[PDB]
Amino acid sequence: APRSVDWREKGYVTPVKNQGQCGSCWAFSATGALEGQMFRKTGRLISLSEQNLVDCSGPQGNEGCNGGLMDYAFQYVQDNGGLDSEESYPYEATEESCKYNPKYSVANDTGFVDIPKQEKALMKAVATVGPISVAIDAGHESFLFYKEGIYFEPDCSSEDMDHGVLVVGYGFESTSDNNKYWLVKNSWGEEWGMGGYVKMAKDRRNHCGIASAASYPTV
């Protein structure tokens, strides 16, 4: 694999969004991964509707503003035969009745791939596929108040993840002893972290569980 990857530079990634006070992180992770894969397929980057996921994917197991799984979201898109654009079905940050309209579907998927639970496998997937949905342990205030640099939290769990985010690349800082990172897009607005991104510690024993539940949709 390349020593560094950044899919933002290749046009795969929409600007950072803000889930607000709705527990819809999973929906933002899922739209980010699907935005990437649709861009690979068609050459068109189109922002996708998180609200469509929040309102409509209960049958697949998602719980609206009380949590969900990216793979359940990918299953919804396949079962449903589509997913509306962000423009057509804007974000409300509250769980509402399903308003999916197939006229404004701009994305599709045919299933999903769960990546083997190791960072070397995650790196291979990021290098070859595009942005990847991942689960992390975000349950420390060190993460809440992250500003810049490589995030490392000694108490982070590799097994107990509570936040879905998007790996858009990886690389290394030239600074000191530990310098590799995953480039991660969050859904907490541009104010948080590095314009909404966090450099998460890479190749340090699956830090925060970033390789424990990684997946992407097939298109």
Ligand SMILES: *C(=N)C1(NC(=O)[C@@H]2C[C@@H](S(=O)(=O)c3ccccc3Cl)CN2C(=O)C2(c3ccc(Br)cc3)CC2)CC1
């Ligand atoms: C986002 N605003 C919040 N977190 C979640 O919904 C979070 C996303 C995924 S995960 O990425 O943490 C994960 C964890 C374990 C295994 C796979 C994945 Cl993808 C699940 N989330 C959770 O917080 C849990 C969950 C699992 C399933 C359902 Br349905 C609801 C919630 C508790 C694991 C709401 C804060």
